[PDB]
A paper describes a structure:
Omniligase-1 is a broadly applicable enzyme for peptide bond formation between an activated acyl donor peptide and a non-protected acyl acceptor peptide. The enzyme is derived from an earlier subtilisin variant called peptiligase by several rounds of protein engineering aimed at increasing synthetic yields and substrate range. Mutation A225N in the S1′ pocket and F189W of the S2′ pocket increased the synthesis to hydrolysis (S/H) ratio and overall coupling efficiency, whereas the I107V mutation was added to S4 pocket to increase the reaction rate. The final omniligase variants appeared to have a very broad substrate range, coupling more than 250 peptides in a 400-member library of acyl acceptors, as indicated by a high-throughput FRET assay.
Crystals of variants containing a Trp at position 189 were only found after a long incubation time for Pre-4 (Ptl-M222P/L217H/A225N/F189W) and Pre-5 (Ptl-M222P/L217H/A225N/F189W/N218D). Mutation S218D in Pre-5 is involved in the S1′ and S2′ pockets but has no influence on the structure. The structures of Pre-4 and Pre-5 each contain three protein molecules in the asymmetric unit (molecules A-C). In addition to the role of Phe189 in crystal formation, we observed that for both Pre-4 and Pre-5, crystallization resulted in at least one substrate binding site occupied by a peptide sequence. Variants Pre-4 and Pre-5 crystallized in crystal form C containing three protein molecules (A, B and C) in the asymmetric unit. The structures of molecules A and B are highly similar with an RMSD (root-mean square deviation) of 0.3 Å. They have oxidized cysteine and an unoccupied active site like ligases Pre-1 to Pre-3. In crystal form C the structure of molecule C is more different with RMSDs of 0.6 – 0.7 Å to molecules A and B. It has an oxidized cysteine and a bound eglin fragment (41′-46′ (SPVTLAG P5 -P1′)) that was used as a crystallization aid. In this crystal form C, we also observed a crystallization artifact; part of the loop from Ile205 to His217 of molecule C is forcibly drawn into the active site of molecule B, mimicking a peptide substrate.
Author numbering: 1 to 75, 85 to 276
Write the structure that this text describes.
């Protein structure tokens, strides 16, 4: 039944909830596989599809974007989620689709973009779009990737790897890096990403593992901070999260450490 992530307490969102800050009026674009807006535990504020063969962003056959929505709302329950569908049934999207998604978020005045997606390769056009979003004042959050460690190599995927993006890696209930959490100098912060229980299509609930759930907590945290400091820039929101993180291990593996949204929202 009504599953709340252990990660909501781990990042200290309850401190903000009890001050009456729950991400009210903050527009968050979930750029992903869609959101089952059927689910009676989710609010969805609107959406768009850039998958040519799947015009419905409110149908989630992959079941990924529905899980993403629940975790963002578990952290920021009165945020306005927008279902920006850029991934098809095979679980991938063309760069053009993802870019159309980012352009859509810019044109429709999103405060936060969550990208629980990545590839091994970037494009000039993807980097341009992401940089443009951040230049226009959008907080852009992305999953660091699930490619683990690879000796001395960065394994952080695009677009998390871009400096303009907040790359999020995954820890468990003990603040230990998940072994599949991508690593490298481009990694910014960590959040819970192991057995994260959230909403699934058809009024269901279930655990997922990944940097996807980790980034969902950070996107929610951005929404809480802007709830309380509506006049903060994306720059100030990003600084608050990075400078107040609980230091864990070396920054190659853990970046700045675990986000503390309570500490971030005083800063």
């Amino acid at each position: 039944a009504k599953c709340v992530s252990y990660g909501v307490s781990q990042i200290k969102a309850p401190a903000l909830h009890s001050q009456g800050y729950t991400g009210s009026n903050v527009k968050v674009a979930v750029i992903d596989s869609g959101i089952d807006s059927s689910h009676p535990d989710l609010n969805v504020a609107g959406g768009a599809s850039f998958v040519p063969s799947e015009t419905n962003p409110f149908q989630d056959n992959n079941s990924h974007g529905t899980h993403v929505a629940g975790t963002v709302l578990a952290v920021a329950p009165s945020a306005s989620l927008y279902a920006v569908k850029v991934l098809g049934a095979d679980g991938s999207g063309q760069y053009s689709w993802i870019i159309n998604g980012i352009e859509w978020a810019i044109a429709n005045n999103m405060d936060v973009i969550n990208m629980s997606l990545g590839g091994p390769s970037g494009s000039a056009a993807l980097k341009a779009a992401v940089d443009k979003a951040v230049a226009s004042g959008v907080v852009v959050v992305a999953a660091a990737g699930n490619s683990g460690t690879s000796g001395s190599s960065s394994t952080v995927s695009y677009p998390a790897k871009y400096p303009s993006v907040i790359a999020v890696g995954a820890v468990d209930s003990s603040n230990q890096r998940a072994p599949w959490s991508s690593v490298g100098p481009e990694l910014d912060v960590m959040a819970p990403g192991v057995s994260i229980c959230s909403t699934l299509p058809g009024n269901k609930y279930g655990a997922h593992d990944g940097t996807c759930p980790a980034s969902n907590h950070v996107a929610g945290a951005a929404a809480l901070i802007l709830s309380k400091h509506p006049n903060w820039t994306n720059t100030q929101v990003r600084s608050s999260l990075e400078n107040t993180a609980t230091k864990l291990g070396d920054s190659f593996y853990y970046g700045k450490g675990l986000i503390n949204v309570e500490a971030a929202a005083q800063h």
